[PDB]
């Protein structure tokens, strides 16, 4: 664990399978009275 | 001043109906942050929203309006955008009725008849606008394609009292 | 420490954070935390 740490493997597979996974009134308030 | 009133209306029937058939065509109606196929910067319209920078520059798919009966219609009406074709159909009737009044003057109802669909084009406009940003909503700017819309209800109002004008005119001439 | 912790990091925000302040001129970083107090004190929210 502590090689795999020093080598950025942890980082790796981290950002891999973590990061790479990826007011005022409207007038939809008011919209019937508009119509 | 008839000469002038009807040169007024025949240069704003061109305007308000060059206008309308421009701000639908042109796609440039809102400047968003979508996707073109991450997000970009891009310029929506009616039909088709594309980036305005990146690799995708220049490329871009037709708008997919579709993803409780309230949001069904309200999503197909502004998926058609019957209500700005609709003021482009109205505008064109509007604009061929200032043209025939000169082929036909017999008839009195002609200019009359053109005053009505230069405003019910105004109001036809009004809505798809009320509705395009009804729907929209369910950061950003305008672009000047919602202006040149905008811009040319006002001119096609504007016609639309010219030319009732001269109707009312005319006819209070040949009654008194 | 912390920037010692920003300049060996390999996370992709605090990679972004470090490429932004070894470049950023006049220099961001500050010789005491009281020196960094007065400088977001009187830079009127334009220093974090």
Known sequence: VLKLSEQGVLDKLKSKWWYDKGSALSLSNVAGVFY | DRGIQMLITTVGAFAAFSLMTIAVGTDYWLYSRGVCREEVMTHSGLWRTCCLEGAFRGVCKKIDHFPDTAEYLLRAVRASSVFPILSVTLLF????????????????????????????????????????????????????????????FIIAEIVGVVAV???????????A | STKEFFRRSKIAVFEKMWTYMKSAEPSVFVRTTEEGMIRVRKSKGKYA
């Open chain 2, 93 to 152: 009737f509007g604009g061929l009725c200032v043209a025939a009044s000169e082929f036909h003057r017999s008839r009195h109802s002609v200019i009359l008849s053109a005053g009505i669909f230069f405003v019910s084009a105004g109001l036809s406009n009004i809505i798809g606008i009320i509705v395009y940003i009804s729907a929209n909503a369910g950061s950003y700017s305008y672009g000047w394609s919602f202006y040149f819309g905008a811009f040319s």
């Open chain 2, 165 to 175: 004008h001269i109707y009312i005119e005319k006819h209070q001439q040949l009654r």
